[PDB]
């Protein structure tokens, strides 16, 4: 009695086509974006929807990619229409952080450096290590995009983002370039000369190399090619870069905070002035001061109790300047000074782009901002002494209405828009200008440090010209963090069947590795209990790495057409790279020309499967989502609306039929 080799824990027919999908790294959750541009998160068990993240003003309405952090504690997605990018908390469908990028994003890969690396020589103090500022929280609940400063007194957002080892979120697209975002926050490189559209991005665990798969178009067809770029600065100076990305993010977060604080005083003071002013009898004069039903609504009580309204407003704005803005300015100068102590060590730090000079200038501009702020505080004192001058002599005039130099102040005030202007002002703009060039230089230096490349072209054909959404799942890139390699999975079409190939290179660019190229023909499918054997002609509809040693595959039987025609197959690498006859599967050609142009050169291993595979039952299946950790997986269909979720460690409870 026979059980086909996987067990199905859930099946749904989704209301919207699924445009992209990815499993969590550590958990039984899966993430999907549909064509409504909403991001769905689902549980394994009976493919239950955990939450929906629909679009709005700060999202886009069109999402291209999704990337989990290696934690799985943070999901990221890309908005193509509004050209921005969101960092989603897992436990709730809200934007934990977000930022714009220049042009649309077609690919993302979010990496993290080894634990062995995280270890810290201590050049720093509780504040210096910390990634983000925590300062008195901002009364405006409009945080705009990212709620960090606005959310009240939660360390947790900051701890979640920054209390972790260096992690880098790599971005790619058709725009001509690739960016690298430390911590998922600050941009520490931009690489150019990237031709066409990015299909796939993989940055190494050890930061020795970045691999790229890219599609270019001679207008009849398209060519797809693999690239391995060298990231040498990232390797040799890890720790300086991690330290300087920590201080750089922090600094940019301050810039944001002192912006918001400044915004904050301005809107509050604006609205109190408005509500006061137009609250406001035929006789012409503005200055009556030297209308008695002045006193039949607003009274000797009313005067006092407009009074506290206003000195309180004023108190909000000083307290705001000192406690919020000035102390942000202060922290700025502490990280600045530490940064100049970095750039003091000439040889260590600046192959990475910190001018001692630029930092020095930034610091002087900050000082001028603090000082222009201290200068602002007594524009406030004097405005106050006038207003409350006015108030007090007026009070007496109101109860003298029953039974000096700042009388001139009273007149001046009535003529008064005096606080309006005082807040040339924007030193803000110029401070953040100088700082912004300091921050933006390392990005460019490093991106220019990645100029070396390997090129292996893969194939040129019309396969993608027929337009239904491609999902950018394939071809596929995998880093093997234990054996330190790059795997690329791709298909090339021969007999008008797609033949599956596995390419692999050493993470270090100057060194080679066994069996760089090998293809796969699938010979026989059978089980150990039924000795019916399936031997047919199969084409490869998809593939994705399950774990370090295994690859999930989806095949189309060429000959089975209605519902009985597609197969799900686990492929063990230990038998592809099998120690004995691995020597007689060897590439006979050259990487100097395309791979698809020489087929008879590429070694094919005929492999006969008796375990770990299933015919898919009236399924229609096209694409696969592997999870090797939590040992589940998931299969999406031709119509992008139909999913089938398997526990992959278990046989089905359901016995099998065959004719």
Residue numbers in the entry: 6 to 129, 132 to 287, 294 to 303, 318 to 430, 445 to 457, 473 to 479, 522 to 757
Quote the paper.
We used the Xenopus Apc4 coordinates to determine the full-length human Apc4 structure to a similar resolution by molecular replacement. Apc4 adopts a bi-domain architecture, dominated by a 360-residue seven-bladed WD40 β-propeller domain (Apc4WD40) split by the HBD (Apc4HBD) predominantly composed of four long α-helices. Apc4HBD is inserted between strands C and D of blade 4 of the WD40 domain, extending away from the wider lower surface of the β-propeller such that, together, the HBD and WD40 domain generate an L-shaped molecule. Human and X. laevis Apc4 are also very similar, differing only for residues 120–130 (X. laevis Apc4 numbering) within the shorter WD40 insert that is an α-helix in the X. laevis Apc4 structure in contrast to a predominantly disordered loop structure in human Apc4. C-terminal residues (758–808) of human Apc4 are disordered in both the crystal structure and the EM density map. In the context of the APC/C, due to interactions with Apc5, regions of Apc4 that are disordered in the crystal structures adopt ordered α-helical conformations (α4, α9 and α10). In the EM density map, secondary structural features are well defined, whereas secondary structural elements at the tip and periphery of Apc4HBD that are resolved in the EM density map are disordered in the X-ray structure (α4, α9 and α10). In contrast, whereas the X-ray map shows well-resolved side-chain densities for residues of Apc4WD40, in the EM map, these side chains are poorly defined, particularly for residues of Apc4WD40 at the periphery of the APC/C, for example, blades 5 and 6. In the human Apc4 crystal, Apc4WD40 is secured through lattice contacts with two neighboring molecules (data not shown).
